[PDB]
Amino acid sequence: MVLMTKPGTSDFVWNGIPLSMELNLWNIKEYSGSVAMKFDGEKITFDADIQNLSPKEPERYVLGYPEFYYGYKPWENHTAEGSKLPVPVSSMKSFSVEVSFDIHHEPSLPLNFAMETWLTREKYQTEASIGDVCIMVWFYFNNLTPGGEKIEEFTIPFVLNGESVEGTWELWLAEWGWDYLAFRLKDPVKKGRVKFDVRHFLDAAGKALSSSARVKDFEDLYFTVWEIGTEFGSPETKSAQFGWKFENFSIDLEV
Numbered sequence: 465m466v467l468m469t470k471p472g473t474s475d476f477v478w479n480g481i482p483l484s485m486e487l488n489l490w491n492i493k494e495y496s497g498s499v500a501m502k503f504d505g506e507k508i509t510f511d512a513d514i515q516n517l518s519p520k521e522p523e524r525y526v527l528g529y530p531e532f533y534y535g536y537k538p539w540e541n542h543t544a545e546g547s548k549l550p551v552p553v554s555s556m557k558s559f560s561v562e563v564s565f566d567i568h569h570e571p572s573l574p575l576n577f578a579m580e581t582w583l584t585r586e587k588y589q590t591e592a593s594i595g596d597v598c599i600m601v602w603f604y605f606n607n608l609t610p611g612g613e614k615i616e617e618f619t620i621p622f623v624l625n626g627e628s629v630e631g632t633w634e635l636w637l638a639e640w641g642w643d644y645l646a647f648r649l650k651d652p653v654k655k656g657r658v659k660f661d662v663r664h665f666l667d668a669a670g671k672a673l674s675s676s677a678r679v680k681d682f683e684d685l686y687f688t689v690w691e692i693g694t695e696f697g698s699p700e701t702k703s704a705q706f707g708w709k710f711e712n713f714s715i716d717l718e719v
């Protein structure tokens with residue numbers, strides 16, 4: 465069992481897949497109270513009951529992103545050993561991700577259940593900047609909209625509780641220090657099981673960025689990681705009570 469009760473990263477293995485879990489309070493300057501993240505071989509859980517919160521940088525809006533991930537997270541210059549990522553986007557034929565989740569939170573708290581990747585020009589960057597892309601996939605949100613503005617909608621299939629459905633995904637785009645693309649499901653799901661192919665979101669992102677002056681050759685970027693977690697907070701959030709459980713994780717990367 466892996467148990468963390470303060471910010472940090474631990475590597476673990478879940479049904480043979482090497483992963484990293486990060487009790488990530490990246491934009492919190494100070495807090496009081498409790499946080500706990502645990503992996504027991506079958507499930508990863510997170511719980512927070514924190515108060516006296518203030519952000520390091522209110523311009524970043526959210527306060528943290530407790531998560532787990534497969535691959536190399538640029539910002540932490542970290543990857544567990546044994547991951548098949550990073551690989552160039554062009555080499556990915558398909559990348560299936562499956563997980564079951566159950567999110568709970570006080571009603572007022574800005575929060576999402578979001579997955580993400582970082583597409584970078586070089587294989588092991590320690591930051592993203594102009595020319596790089598962040599792609600997020602939001603399956604749930606509460607009192608939180610993605611950054612930038614909504615530009616498009618895409619119909620992309622996924623399997624929900626074992627049934628193939630067609631989701632309608634809003635695409636939000638922001639041009640910051642790097643390009644931010646967030647796909648947000650229009651019928652959010654707070655608890656369930658999802659399976660989907662990341663290649664559909666890479667394809668949509670490539671089309672959306674086809675006329676970009678900032679992103680040069682999208683298919684030559686490196687797909688570095690797949691992160692799964694919950695962003696939370698806004699610049700006004702002073703306390704946060706929420707938690708989640710993830711189970712039934714599997715992936716199939718075909719390169």
Ligand SMILES: OC[C@H]1O[C@@H](O[C@H]2[C@H](O)[C@@H](O)[C@@H](O)O[C@@H]2CO)[C@H](O)[C@@H](O)[C@@H]1O
Nearest residue numbers: 488490526528529539580598600644695
């Ligand atoms: O900016 C560096 C931190 O990024 C964190 O990821 C953020 C990202 O910057 C946002 O634009 C959006 O994609 O949500 C992410 C999660 O909140 C990263 O988790 C931190 O480790 C970095 O310090």
Ligand SMILES: OC[C@H]1O[C@@H](O[C@H]2[C@H](O)[C@@H](O)[C@H](O)O[C@@H]2CO)[C@H](O)[C@@H](O)[C@@H]1O
Nearest residue numbers: 523524525526608609610611612646695
């Ligand atoms: O860290 C950036 C953060 O942005 C979040 O969206 C904010 C956005 O930054 C702000 O300019 C706008 O006014 O409000 C939204 C929130 O509604 C975005 O939700 C996160 O994914 C992203 O991490």
